[PDB]
Structure formats: structure tokens, C-alpha cells
Design a protein around this ligand. Structure first.
Ligand SMILES: [Zn+2]
Ligand SMILES: [Zn+2]
Ligand SMILES: [Zn+2]
Ligand SMILES: [Zn+2]
Ligand SMILES: [Zn+2]
Ligand SMILES: [Zn+2]
Lengths: 86, 86
């Protein structure tokens, strides 16, 4: 047996979650390679960002925008996905 | 019948969660009345802080420090506890 983890765990791939209208998300000035790099609520790990300038958002329009957790091109440091924590 | 909510829901009182060593937490420059006002991970709601300067922390020492969610003396605006969201 092996217990199941979080349904948002995505070890081995990019998260790719598509945001819905009204859904919040996170940005980090220091970690994001640019101001389009974002993390969904299931992925953002506060432990990765102590003393960083974090800025939340809410998706307010139909977008093809997606969570960049697990996309190393989007981040300046390793992230530790919150959904991987047990 | 009425379904149970989140075990961290604390409608009607202050949260009061005591942080453990290694536990992350949140601060908001604009919302906190001072730099001692904090929110635990179960309470911090990103929807309350769009375009605010949010700063995470990790508790690194034995403290009597506690989450201030639901303590109106600690905040400059109404918060909407994440644990109340269904
Ligand atoms: Zn994600
Ligand atoms: Zn992730
Ligand atoms: Zn960061
Ligand atoms: Zn709390
Ligand atoms: Zn709360
Ligand atoms: Zn705020």
C-alpha cells in the first residue's frame, strides 16, 4: 500500500492549471522571471518566499492563462510545490 | 443535515492558532495595523490582498505568537477567512 497524496500534486510535469473567473493566484517579484509568471493557490508555497514581495491576483476575465509551477523557465530559484508536501 | 466545514473555520472568534517551529505564515503591509499582525496559512485569503505587499515568514523559534485572523484590532480592512469559504 501507499497512501494517495494531494489531487493537485504534479511531480514530473508542469502544473498547467487553467484559472477560472474569480480564482485567486500568486506572483512573486523576486522569483518570477517576468510579470507573467504565476502560481495557483494549490502550488504556491509560502516557505519559498520569505521576505520576497508577493502579490496576489484574481482572474477577472476568460484567459488561456495557466499556473507555471514546475516550469523551470518561469522561475529564478527552485520552488517546492505546496501540493507535494505531505 | 448540514455538511461540516473546514476544521480551521472560526467564525465568531479570533483564530488564535499558535505557530509551530517550521510553520509558515503571512503578513500584509497594507492590512496589518503593525508589523506584528499575522495570518496563519489556513486563514490567509489571497482574495483580500490583490496588489498589496504580502510577505511570508516561517516560525523559527518557540513563540507564544498566534494568528490574528478575526481580531479586528489587528487589521485595517475586513478580512474574509479562507477557512470560511465553502
Ligand atoms: Zn499550480
Ligand atoms: Zn505545483
Ligand atoms: Zn519568491
Ligand atoms: Zn488563523
Ligand atoms: Zn481565519
Ligand atoms: Zn492586505
Amino acid at each position: 500500500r501507499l497512501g494517495s497524496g494531494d489531487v493537485h500534486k504534479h511531480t514530473g510535469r508542469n502544473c498547467g492549471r487553467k484559472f477560472k473567473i474569480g480564482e485567486p493566484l500568486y506572483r512573486c517579484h523576486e522569483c518570477g522571471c517576468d510579470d507573467t509568471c504565476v502560481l495557483c493557490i494549490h502550488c504556491f508555497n509560502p516557505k519559498d518566499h520569505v521576505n520576497h514581495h508577493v502579490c496576489t491576483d484574481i482572474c477577472t476575465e476568460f484567459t488561456s492563462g495557466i499556473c507555471d509551477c514546475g516550469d523551470e523557465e518561469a522561475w529564478n530559484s527552485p520552488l517546492h510545490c505546496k501540493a507535494e508536501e505531505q
